[PDB]
């Protein structure tokens, strides 16, 4: 598999359509849609059998996916804002949940 932070065995899911989150105000809705191209559309995860519940699978998926996305991109001069991170957390968690239920059907 892929190696993230010196640990192998990570899986990289197939490209995913980023959902269209409504935050409750026009400004953040517009900021997200205009900036989502800079956020992941595939998530790093580990096989479901390495976890005992959905929350822990998703917590790892969100944590690792955003960490590696920051590493690879923040080399290009990218600078994620405090608010970029919040929106990444919301979109990646949604994609990680979709990945989980998708892996779970095989088990």
């Amino acid at each position, epitope marked *: 598999g892929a190696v993230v*932070g010196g*640990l192998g065995g990570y899986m990289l899911g197939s490209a995913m359509s980023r959902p269209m989150i409504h935050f409750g105000n026009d400004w953040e809705d517009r900021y997200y849609r205009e900036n989502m191209y800079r956020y992941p559309n595939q998530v790093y995860y580990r096989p479901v059998d390495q976890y005992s519940n959905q929350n822990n699978f998703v*917590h790892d998926c969100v944590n*690792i996916t955003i960490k590696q996305h920051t590493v690879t991109t923040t080399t290009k001069g990218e600078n994620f804002t405090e608010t970029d991170v919040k929106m990444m957390e919301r979109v990646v968690e949604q994609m990680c949940v979709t990945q989980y239920q998708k892996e779970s059907q095989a088990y």
Partner: nanobody
Amino acid sequence: QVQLQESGGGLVQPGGSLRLSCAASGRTFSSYNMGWFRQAPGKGREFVASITSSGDKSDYTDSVKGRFTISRDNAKNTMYLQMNNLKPEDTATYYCARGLGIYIIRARGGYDHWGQGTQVTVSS
């Protein structure tokens, strides 16, 4: 190679407390993240808590948040788990392990050098 040994397990009544210890042989203790897993009868090892090599950050599974406290003394080659307000479903064998890679995660595959484990029984 480096060896980990858990100790401190035993019998405690519900509501009670226990302090687990993980002692490491060797020479590199403070260079690695560390974590705790547990295994209840008829179940597999599940993540309990973890802590970075320096102790600056920690992580906990939801069922123990606010009740368990992980810590380490890099001078003593020892990691600790303080368990308060114990419950009958905390009964399990508790294992300590050495983190693989630089990111503390919750997957079973994030750790190796598993100790032999110590038994914790919570009943009256």
